């Protein structure tokens, strides 16, 4: 899971 | 950042917020006109917000500068997140000052156990969501490749490293992507991904910036 919003 | 601490205003002067009407990713200012962030942060309409502390309040020291170029690594793979690096050129050079400062690129990769500062405005909860106003910081060590690969078998490429904690509770999190992992004054990592945030045995995974220094330099030099 990428950590962007 | 989960389990971190309030950095203190402008104490991470290379930290930028990428804003598209909201903070969506971090980035690191690497010279007055260029920011390093994560490729997965790419989007149109990026405004780079430098000098931020409270990202919801204009406190002074901010510089909001549109991205003029957003250069995702050509080999970025959005499924594996390999090459999760993007360069953003600012439409105009930021005014560098004590609160808006570039961070050096690494001259060499960091070893396991290197302590780094990871920062961002991402979620501060490992379960649920709380997005901070102010920049949060986490001191976190780079984990060994073996531990990283053990935590994320088959998912860690040579362009990634893990950093943080296996005991849980301290990690970068959503909204921190793209932001810096700075170790000994060098941008060694970009917040990239992880399995959840601050979960036991699931450290953060970071783009290994040292693998991209030449790419960064070459890309900047040609843009
Ligand atoms: Ca602000």
Half-sphere exposure of B213 (CA within 13 A, CB side): 13
Cβ–Cβ pairs < 8 A, chains A and B: 44
Closest CA to B105 of B188, B219, B183, B26: B188
The tokens describing B66, both together, are: 């549109």
All residues of chain A having their beta carbon less than 8 Å from the beta carbon of residue B178 are: 4
CATH 2.40.10.10 positions along chain B are 13-102+211-222
Per DSSP, the three-state class of B219 is helix
Closest-approach residue (CA) in chain A for B174: A3
Beta bridge partners of B171: B2
The tokens describing B71, both together, are: 């250069």
Q: Quickly tell me which residue has 């976190």 as its tokens.
A: B140
Total H helices, total E strands in chain A: 0, 0
All residues of chain B having their beta carbon less than 8 Å from the beta carbon of residue A2 are: 38, 40, 81, 84, 174, 177, 192-193
What is d(CA B152, CA B202) in angstroms, rounded to the nearest whole number? 8
B191 to A3: CB separation less than 8 angstroms, yes or no: yes
The DSSP bridge pattern shows strands B15-19 and B47-50 to be antiparallel
Alpha helix stretches (DSSP H) within chain B: 145-151, 213-221
Question: Which regions of chain B does DSSP assign to beta strands (E)?
Answer: 5-6, 15-19, 23-31, 34-37, 47-50, 63-72, 86-90, 115-120, 136-141, 160-163, 180-183, 186-193, 204-208
Total H helices, total E strands in chain B: 2, 13
Q: Which fold has domain B13-102+211-222?
A: Thrombin, subunit H (2.40.10)
B193 to A1: CB separation less than 8 angstroms, yes or no: yes
Ligand 1 centroid vs B9 CA: distance in angstroms? 9
What's this structure's resolution in Å?
Answer: 1.3
What is d(CA B175, CA B144) in angstroms, rounded to the nearest whole number? 25
What is d(CA B208, CA B106) in angstroms, rounded to the nearest whole number? 10
């Amino acid at each position: 899971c990428t950590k962007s919003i | 950042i989960v389990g971190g601490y309030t950095c203190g205003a402008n104490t991470v002067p290379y930290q930028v917020s990428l804003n598209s009407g909201y903070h969506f990713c971090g980035g690191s200012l690497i010279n007055s006109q260029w920011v390093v962030s994560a490729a997965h942060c790419y989007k149109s309409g990026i405004q780079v917000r430098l000098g931020e502390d409270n990202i919801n309040v204009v406190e002074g020291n901010e510089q909001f500068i549109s991205a003029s170029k957003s250069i995702v690594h050509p080999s970025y793979n959005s499924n594996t997140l390999n090459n999760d690096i993007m360069l953003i050129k600012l439409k105009s050079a930021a005014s560098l000052n004590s609160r808006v400062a570039s961070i050096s690129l690494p001259t060499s990769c960091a070893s396991a156990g290197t302590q780094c500062l990871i920062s961002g405005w991402g979620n501060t909860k490992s379960s649920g969501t709380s997005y901070p106003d102010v920049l949060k910081c986490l001191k976190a060590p780079i984990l060994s490749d073996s531990s990283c690969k053990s935590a994320y078998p088959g998912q860690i490429t040579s362009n990634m490293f893990c950093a943080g904690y296996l005991e849980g509770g301290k990690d970068s999190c959503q909204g921190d992507s793209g932001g810096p992992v700075v170790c000994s004054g060098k941008l060694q990592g970009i917040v990239s991904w992880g399995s959840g945030c601050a979960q036991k045995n699931k450290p953060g995974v970071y783009t290994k910036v040292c693998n991209y220094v030449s790419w960064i330099k070459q890309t900047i030099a040609s843009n």
